[PDB]
Amino acid sequence: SMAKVQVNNVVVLDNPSPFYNPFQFEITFECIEDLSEDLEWKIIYVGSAESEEYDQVLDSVLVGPVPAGRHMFVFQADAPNPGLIPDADAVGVTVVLITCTYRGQEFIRVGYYVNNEYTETELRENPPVKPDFSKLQRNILASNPRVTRFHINWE
């Protein structure tokens, strides 16, 4: 069958923000017909390129009833746990992902680069071994989303 859900756009809200602020995404999509089963959205923070074990599922949203037509919703998730981020990966560029599954199958993955940078010159010039997350600013590169679609069984 044809893809029954088509994501139209994601707006990154509160985009330059302190590291400890929650993520906020305003997501619009279309359903070509009433879906009987649930859509599950997730936000996944890539703690390190070292390994997927440093991935953090920040939150999941499950919608039981699906109606046909255009949709908008706002997806908010708490910031990642800095205790689980390797020291060498915290300051710099990482990735945050938005995924959606239907009947348990991921059909779309929207990835953004995330640039975490210090706000004080002293910290930028002499970064501590353990990063000071209270002084880190998160900038999501909202203009350059990377979209991957997956074929799933929509019936």
Residue numbers in the entry: 2 to 156
Give sentences from the paper.
By binding histone H3–H4 dimers, the histone chaperone ASF1 facilitates nucleosome assembly and turnover and modulates histone post-translational modifications. ASF1 consists of an N-terminal 155-residue immunoglobulin-like domain (ASF1-NT) followed by a presumably unstructured C-terminal tail. As expected from prior structures of human and yeast ASF119,20,59, ASF1a-NT adopted an immunoglobulin (Ig) domain-like fold, composed of a β sandwich topped by α helices. Specifically, phosphorylation of the C-terminal tail of histone-free ASF1 by tousled-like kinases (TLKs) increases its association with the H3–H4 dimer and downstream chaperones, which has been suggested to promote the provision of histones for chromatin assembly.
